[PDB]
Design a protein around this ligand. Structure first.
Ligand SMILES: C[C@H](O)c1ccc(CCOc2ccc(C[C@@H]3SC(=O)NC3=O)cc2)nc1
Ligand SMILES: CCCCCCCCC(=O)O
Ligand SMILES: CCCCCCCCC(=O)O
Length: 255
């Protein structure tokens, strides 16, 4: 019954709004500078970066880490709202979060991105994509595979109500390594998938096979994760004085 699926979509959108302070709707309002009620400060070079706070590669990279830590907390809070998630085996809850978190982080990061750069500090700032490309040897290319994905993902023109369901689909995957009880997870995802299918058809009725196209984006997400992990392996060998946040460490451990 579509009634049940619409109620699920609404519940998820409500929890998403409650769990993620900076929505795509607010991020697009900032990025499209037309509503200059609160425009971002733009960091495009070394000089602008100094005044924006009014080694540099390491400080930027670690700011990304801290933002992911905060995102993990929001995503975990959201996950608990997904009907059935907290009733799963606790080992599996942890496993679902462990593998789902970075795929959600890069999905939602696209909301804060355009072709030219990315919002930072809760939207108060905007850091240029070419400034990020211009950082020292290992850090020079850490953001570019995120921007390339966002440009493509953002062409789908999903809004927060769509993303709320898609993020839930991601979490309740069931092909995650080491899951104990796959069937209850897959049963939740089937219902989530039905809701997402109906949501995209009602919200984007002119957008042919949006559902399929969105599901194909998972390949792109999983490949951003793998390339980030190997870059981390380079970082820890050349940057022995650089601490990684323990929450991030545990997520990355044995992935
Ligand atoms: C510090 C500087 O002002 C700055 C620049 C850009 C942004 C936008 C967010 O850009 C992100 C990039 C990567 C990750 C994934 C992290 S990064 C890591 O090492 N492990 C993970 O999970 C998250 C977010 N925010 C702050
Ligand atoms: C790049 C800013 C990192 C700390 C955020 C607090 C500073 C506020 C600001 O950017 O104006
Ligand atoms: C990546 C978007 C998920 C919500 C954005 C969190 C606030 C953005 C920020 O502080 O950089």
């Amino acid at each position: 019954e579509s009634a049940d699926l619409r109620a699920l979509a609404k519940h998820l959108y409500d929890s998403y709004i409650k769990s993620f302070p900076l929505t795509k709707a607010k991020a697009r309002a900032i990025l499209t500078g037309k509503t200059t009620d609160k425009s971002p400060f733009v960091i495009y070079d070394m000089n602008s970066l100094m005044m924006g706070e009014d080694e540099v590669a390491i400080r930027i990279f670690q700011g990304c880490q801290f933002r992911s830590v905060e995102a993990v907390q929001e995503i975990t809070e959201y996950a608990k709202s997904i009907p059935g998630f907290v009733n799963l085996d606790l080992n599996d809850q942890v496993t679902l979060l462990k593998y789902g978190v970075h795929e959600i982080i890069y999905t939602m990061l696209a909301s804060l991105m355009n072709k030219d750069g990315v919002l930072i500090s809760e939207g108060q700032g905007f850091m240029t994509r070419e400034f990020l490309k211009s950082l020292r040897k290992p850090f020079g290319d850490f953001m570019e595979p995120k921007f390339e994905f966002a440009v493509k993902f953002n062409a789908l023109e999903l809004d927060d109500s769509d993303l709320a369901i898609f993020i839930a689909v991601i979490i309740l995957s069931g092909d995650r390594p080491g899951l104990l009880n796959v069937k209850p997870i897959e049963d939740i995802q089937d219902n989530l998938l039905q809701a997402l299918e109906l949501q995209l058809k009602l919200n984007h009725p002119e957008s042919s096979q949006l559902f399929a196209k969105l599901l194909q984006k998972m390949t792109d997400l999983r490949q951003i994760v793998t390339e980030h992990v190997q870059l981390l392996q380079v970082i820890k060998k050349t940057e022995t004085d650089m601490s990684l946040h323990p929450l991030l460490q545990e997520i990355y451990k044995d992935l």
